[PDB]
């Protein structure tokens, strides 16, 4: 049966879970993304109960890989209507400054005698063409757009089994298979779907918007993606609507337009709350893929872990990693309000490296924990906790080994920890 | 009546660099009053007076034929064009190195350009100076014709870049990467006349003809360059600079939009005009043949009406009210370069 864990710290009393390996140790759980998992147990051999091996399962945050197509820059524009009545002849093309606009559509009207709209400022009787046009001026880039081709979700699995340590990236199709441990990411539920268009108003780490309907074959002024700036050039929409030849002051011919005059970007801004937004952390983009970490628990993973029953206890307990803890400094204050920081010199021996967790206990309960990869020699670890009462000298505890010295505090995350300690 | 010209200053003045620039559109004045226009200062800075001297312009106008029979239908010959030399004073005609060294010389440039139709001219007043004048001057009152201009210096955010989702992004200072955060900034360029003895290095019109891939033109003898200012505050930019990515992009925007932005009064928002037709003229008027062409129009003042012929290195200044002078770089003959140029430039950006 699966167990849907959630991020947050829970006050636990002293203790460290010990599991006698009579059967395969099986873990079935689902955790949210942006939530690191820390599962720590001592695996004990049923025969010779003094053979206990450390097991530390560290599951890093979920990174999401998306095969993407670079669609270019979305562009805002200004709807400008212009009417040019030629006093004679046809309407010239690309002969005036307004026809340098990024994109435009013009309609050529014949001169109809008897209409009555004859301007008095032509050198005589004007009989030429009336060139009515819509001109999109002052085109500005408002952000980049990317189309999702495919999606893949991986989580970094790090394991400390006895004196051995390994880290491997796991995804749905590439389970971690070792001789003793198997980590399988069986499924991933997502807010992102293939063919979605990701729009970034600013930098990548500033967030994005999801568009289910992004203009492709038929592009109209006002649609999401109407004006696009591509490497090949400017891709422009149809200016949906029609022209109407009117007469102003019974003298000058003027044209009017029936249709949308608001750009797609401005119509998106007016309805921004209707678009799925998403936050982004540690983004990495190439010419073919986008990689980031969702920090809003929008993603959820399902992980299965199997530890084989027949561990090589003799080879895994040769020179056990020995750490020594000394409490040195403490910042912040106590209580359930302000929280505190605990500095501790941790000295491991025998082993070259060691993945474990140091905890912040008092006399009765632990209020915080920090997991780190200890490098041979001296290590300085910082622990953040919350709680304590008069005389609760805060100390650093490795499972159950706490430092001899204890430090008291002063007057007034999204991680999962599971070391089997009693609640 | 008075009009407030706002000088949008950076917040860092003591640690600031470059210049501060502003511009304002003035009400239209009739054509007769143009030659007697004088820009009066009364400010508390060091005004550069070179632009306040007289310069000969070939005033080039069109008008309907006086002897036009009743109900005569408009044609290419129902109207005439004429040209004559006239002394104009106060226009934006900055000598070289003046704007570039304004930060060191601590001088302030104030001038105006003209955007005209057949009967009136609308002046666009430009004012640029050192960053420190945002403190030493603060408030002033300029004067032009029957108009006064209240000059205010106010500290403003993102004077040199663009606001993206509330965060200021300035153009990249150099271009190692490829394509990333793009900002769109306004540039105001000013034509500079600078001749050299031998080379073709100052024939800027040959650079435009290269950008539009037009071969075989020989009427590009003009010698000069442009000095641009980005936003309301930046260091002066030399156009063209062969290793500056900003220079190549500003030059490219000029090649495909030679007349730049308009100085329209978007009130009423009824953009209707009458195209009188293609016209040619004599610049200077003592010439024996036509040297400049354009499009004669009738309507409200829209684009700049001043420029120089690209053919002569001795600058032939043309003031053509009611005529949009030929600026398309793809032609070879009778083309002009504008005195001032306003555009919007897409540039790679980075956070302040």
């Amino acid at each position: 049966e699966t167990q849907n864990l959630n991020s947050g710290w829970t006050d636990t009393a002293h203790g460290s879970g010990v599991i006698p390996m009579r059967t395969d140790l099986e873990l079935d759980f689902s955790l949210p993304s942006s939530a690191s998992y820390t599962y720590r147990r001592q695996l004990q051999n049923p025969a010779n109960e003094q053979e206990k091996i450390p097991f530390h399962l560290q599951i890093s945050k979920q990174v999401i890989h998306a095969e993407i197509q670079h669609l270019g820059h979305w562009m805002d524009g200004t709807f400008n209507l212009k009417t040019a009545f030629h006093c004679y002849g046809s309407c010239e093309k690309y002969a005036y400054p307004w026809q340098t606009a990024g994109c435009f559509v013009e309609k050529d009207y014949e001169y109809e005698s008897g209409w009555g709209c004859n301007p008095a400022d032509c050198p005589g009787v004007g009989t030429g063409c009336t060139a009515c046009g819509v001109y999109l001026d002052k085109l500005k880039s408002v952000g980049k757009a990317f189309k999702i081709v495919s999606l893949r979700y991986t989580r970094k699995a790090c394991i400390q089994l006895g004196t051995e340590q390994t880290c491997k990236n796991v995804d749905s199709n590439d389970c971690l298979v070792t001789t003793s441990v198997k980590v399988c990411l069986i499924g991933t539920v997502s807010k992102f779907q293939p063919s979605d268009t990701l729009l970034f108003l600013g930098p990548l780490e500033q967030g994005g918007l999801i568009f289910k309907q992004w203009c492709t074959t038929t592009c109209q002024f006002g649609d999401p993606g109407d004006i696009m700036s591509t490497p090949v050039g400017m891709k422009c929409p149809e200016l949906s609507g029609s022209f109407r030849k009117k007469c102003a002051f019974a003298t000058t011919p003027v044209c009017q337009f029936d249709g949308n005059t608001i750009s797609g970007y401005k119509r998106m801004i007016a309805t921004k709350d209707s678009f799925q937004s998403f936050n982004v952390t540690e983004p990495h983009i190439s010419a073919s893929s986008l990689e980031w970490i969702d920090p809003d628990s929008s993603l959820r993973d399902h992980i299965n872990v199997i530890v084989g029953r027949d561990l090589s206890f003799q080879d895994l307990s040769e020179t056990p990693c020995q750490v020594d803890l000394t409490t040195t400094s403490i910042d912040g204050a106590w209580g359930s309000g302000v929280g505190f920081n605990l500095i501790c010199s941790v000295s491991l021996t025998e082993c070259s490296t060691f993945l474990t967790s140091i905890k912040a206990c008092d006399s009765a309960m632990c209020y915080g924990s920090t997991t780190a990869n200890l490098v041979r020699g001296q290590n300085t670890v910082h622990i953040v906790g919350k709680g304590g009462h008069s005389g609760s000298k805060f100390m650093c505890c490795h499972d159950t080994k706490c430092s001899s010295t204890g430090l008291v505090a002063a007057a007034p995350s999204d991680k999962i920890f599971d070391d089997g300690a009693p609640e | 009546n008075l009009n407030e010209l706002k000088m949008e200053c950076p917040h860092t003045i003591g640690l600031g660099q470059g210049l501060v620039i502003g511009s304002i559109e003035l009400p239209p004045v009739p054509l007769i009053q143009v030659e007697s226009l004088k820009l009066e200062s009364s400010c508390n800075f060091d005004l550069h007076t070179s632009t306040s001297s007289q310069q000969a312009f070939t005033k080039w106008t069109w008008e309907v034929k006086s002897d036009l029979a009743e109900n005569t239908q408009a044609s290419s010959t129902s109207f005439q064009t004429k040209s004559s030399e006239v002394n104009l004073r106060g226009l934006c005609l900055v000598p070289p190195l003046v704007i570039e060294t304004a930060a060191r010389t601590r001088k302030t440039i104030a001038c105006f350009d003209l955007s005209c139709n057949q009967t009136t001219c609308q002046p666009t007043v430009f004012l640029m100076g050192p960053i420190q004048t945002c403190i030493t001057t603060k408030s002033c009152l300029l004067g032009l014709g029957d108009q006064r201009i209240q000059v205010n210096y106010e500290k403003t955010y993102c004077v040199s870049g663009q606001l993206i989702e509330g965060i200021c992004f300035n153009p990249v200072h150099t271009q190692p990467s490829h394509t990333y955060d793009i900002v769109t900034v306004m540039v105001r360029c000013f034509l500079i006349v600078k001749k050299v003895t031998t080379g073709d290095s100052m024939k800027i019109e040959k650079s435009f003809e290269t950008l539009v891939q037009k071969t075989g033109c020989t009427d590009n003898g003009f010698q000069g360059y442009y000095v641009c200012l980005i936003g309301s505050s930046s260091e002066p930019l030399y156009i063209p600079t062969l290793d500056d990515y900003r220079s190549a992009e500003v030059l490219s925007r000029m090649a495909f939009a030679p007349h730049g932005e308009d100085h329209d009064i978007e009130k009423n928002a009824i953009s209707a005009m009458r195209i009188v037709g293609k016209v040619t003229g004599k610049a200077p008027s003592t010439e024996s043949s036509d040297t400049v062409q354009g499009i004669a129009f009738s309507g409200n003042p829209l684009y700049t009406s001043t420029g120089v012929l690209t053919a002569k290195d001795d600058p032939v200044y043309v003031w053509a009210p009611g005529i949009m002078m030929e600026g398309n770089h793809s032609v070879c003959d009778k083309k002009t370069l504008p005195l001032t140029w306003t555009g919007f430039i897409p540039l790679p950006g980075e956070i302040e």
Epitope: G89, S90, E110, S113, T127, G128, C129 | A69, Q73, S75
Partner: antibody
Amino acid sequence: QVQLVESGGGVVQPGRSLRLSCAASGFTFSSYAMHWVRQAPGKGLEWVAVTWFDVSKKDYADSVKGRFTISKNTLYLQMNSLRAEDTAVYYCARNLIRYSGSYFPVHGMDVWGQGTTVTVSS
Amino acid sequence: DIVMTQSPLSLPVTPGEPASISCRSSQSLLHTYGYNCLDWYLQRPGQSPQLLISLGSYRASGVPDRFSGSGSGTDFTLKISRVEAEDVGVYYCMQALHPFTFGGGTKVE
């Protein structure tokens, strides 16, 4: 400048074929109508055909209707089944018209071609 | 049908006097727009025809003031004051609409 140059003129027998051409330059071909006017030896002037409003509308004279078809910025005139009474010097002319499908001039034929000669008699 | 009739087939005169040419139509040339659809052309001995008057009375550009057009309906007239040496040639009135019928020629010398 603006000018019209004709070509393709010659001399053949009745019943054969001939095609004239008129190369225009200096003016927009969609703003002016283009006429063909011939002049028999020692005789007056005779209008032949015309095209206007770009090249979408065409008209011909009764004496030639159905036999000629008025088609680089050049104008063509295909003379098919040219009977022996079309002997003339054929001119190419332009004129300004109101911008509409309905032909109505603003002024007459101002600039003409130098003319081309075609005689058919056997 | 419709045909144009020109008066004197030949108009010989000295240099420096008035001259008159008439052109009469079978039907009215006054269009609903208010213009007389008639032009006046001149053909010098070795030259192509040239434009003198368009739409009855509108003197063409580049044509000196001595030429003048007048008339309405069916009776039109071309006046030329102080005939010069350059005026030699044949004069043709032409209908400005489709049936573009010519007058037939009037010789001056």
